[PDB]
Amino acid sequence: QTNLDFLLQTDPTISGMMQKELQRQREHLELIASENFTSPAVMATQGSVLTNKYAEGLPKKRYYGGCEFIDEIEQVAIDRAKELFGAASANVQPHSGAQANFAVFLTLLKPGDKIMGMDLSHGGHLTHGSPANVSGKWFEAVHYGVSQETEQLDYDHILEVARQERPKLIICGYSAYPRIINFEKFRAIADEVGAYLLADIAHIAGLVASGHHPNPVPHCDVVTTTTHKTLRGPRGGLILTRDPELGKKFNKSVFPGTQGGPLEHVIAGKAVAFGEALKPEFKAYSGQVIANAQAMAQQLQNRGFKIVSGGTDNHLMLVDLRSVNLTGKQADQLVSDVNITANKNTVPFDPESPFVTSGLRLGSPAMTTRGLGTEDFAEIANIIADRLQNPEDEQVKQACVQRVAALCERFPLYPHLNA
């Protein structure tokens, strides 16, 4: 008898909904740029008895008895993180990217200090100073955005904003930014104004780890990330720093500063994900992720769609829909009708509200994990274009549904589960 058997027997309601989610993942193009398909080995750790252990503290320095094997696992996670990112220090306990960022704020700032991040509507994250988040509620948040002429960062402009605002912390790393970030220029800016510098590399962490994006670790005071976007791990957070003394302060801000017990089953999954990312295959995967995103962006452009900034150098893109006279909300609905899963997103300088938007955010990591290549991503672009150009045409609709089904059949997902 298996744990899944017990679930079916004791809670058929939840068992059936979970099986429907597996089928959903199998039968949609999962183009949400922040999603991935984590490995069977990672899922095994998350389904383990490690959930039962209280392990407040750090390896060998715990507030609870019984942590001998949890300590071995968490130290492997730390050591593999330091290896994978070339970092002198790593804390693998943050529950999420948001909680990683907050522990950094607790270390470096006090309430009322000034933080500078990218405007939420230009691709910054809610935890980088949004009024609805603690970062904008308890701190003075100021913003920079992208240039209207390029739709990407203008570093001289960022320097001028920094000089005018004199923030205590500058944040770089974003949620919808398709170009390479120059961490050396951010360090030059931070040094000129005397600010701390955080890189939140959540989206791009797998590309950083594999050498397909510049590395912030030697340049920034601290690097935070999720483990679950391009890094393809379990859902959670991570704090890295080049300064090992500062890293000890970040440890104290994770626990007891902001969290209680760590999720040790998730931390075992982090160890597994970092081990996978250290293999040559992960570098090839990350290169394919970028090639696939570029193939999709280019074919969307061939079909008449505007890509914000004119292309991408990473795994994601924003489609600016003002051309096909659709909002992002409308386009997201229209692609969902043909079994394509994405999310709407404001574009820089968007005339629509954040509840409507002019953009659709698409990314390649999840379908690249399923094995799709560049020609398959050009086919995805053509399905999207066909649907959005002919939203009333039922025969185009069915052709799109069928072409999605063919892609899903060609590239099975977790075929050993509930076959």
Place this chain on the structure above:
Amino acid sequence: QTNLDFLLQTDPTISGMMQKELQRQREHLELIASENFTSPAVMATQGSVLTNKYAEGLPKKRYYGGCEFIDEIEQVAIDRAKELFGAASANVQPHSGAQANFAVFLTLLKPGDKIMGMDLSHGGHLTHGSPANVSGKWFEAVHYGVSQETEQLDYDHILEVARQERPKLIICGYSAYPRIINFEKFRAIADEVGAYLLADIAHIAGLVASGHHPNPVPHCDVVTTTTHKTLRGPRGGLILTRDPELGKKFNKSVFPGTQGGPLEHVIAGKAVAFGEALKPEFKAYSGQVIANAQAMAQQLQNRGFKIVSGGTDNHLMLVDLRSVNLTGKQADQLVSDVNITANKNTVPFDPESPFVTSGLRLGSPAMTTRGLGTEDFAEIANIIADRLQNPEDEQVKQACVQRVAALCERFPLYPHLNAP
């Protein structure tokens, strides 16, 4: 081929360590009061593909596409939590008890406001105002403690402290308090001074759910909890309230106020655990948890040990070593030497450093889940007392080891789990 097979094949290092942890859980008396053994069904949800879904927002009100099935699961979790605790609102997204508490603080307080909680050394939690936690760093946290005479709360004294300090938020619910909490009296106190009232029922949530401890939901502005202590769920948090308008504000403080994406695999596990807690067997389990803790406390007292407050009304106890020639750190080590897992713990009025302590915290939930009864808990007390009374005696040590092994063999843990 299973996910566990993939783990053994691709990461034998982690696979082996994880196996060792299963064996460790099987072969020790797990007396950590805040631990439990969650069910196979809960573990199945946590090991599922639900980890792949981004689901910021709320059911039917998401910022990501594709949430149709996640929305059904999270709404089942919400609905079962509301039924289980009699709450008008529930948010099942907090990643932990600490994060549930922080979302409450973000809703009710601004930095610099005054909060009042139990002193850490008297069993309050770090998130209730410790200066090492955001709660005491960015808020002015004042404290109350237990009576020196009874070693439990004196509600008239708490009232006097509240009248003098005029806190904006009073926090009740604790990490090492063995007696029933009177939430009606805490409400009377909060009302006298105009404070909000939070109950953090992390430790006792399963006893509340089963009717074996008074329910704070009708009396407090908000109730937070962990899902993984006496509630026996996956590791995570939960916010409950009697006031649905406050509930809407707590939702916004969880997301986008405090967190990003929720852990929907864990939330499916919360749904499963709440469904288990709604069944009559859970009520019987919770009554056994208390009877077992009481039996262990009573037999420790029969052996000459002191229990803070003179006994327990719930699942936990502190052995008070202030008058014994061992520290809490040593007592924890000595029981670990005979395969008993606990934690050292500060006692009220402890003369010792928090790195040393004069207490040992013990609880019944995890071994009650394995099937032990009151006579078995009396036996646990006698094993502990034998070891602590004779710390250097090697024959007693080996007898203790054998007696622990006998209990572990008689009451197996997850017997269906094999090696890959």
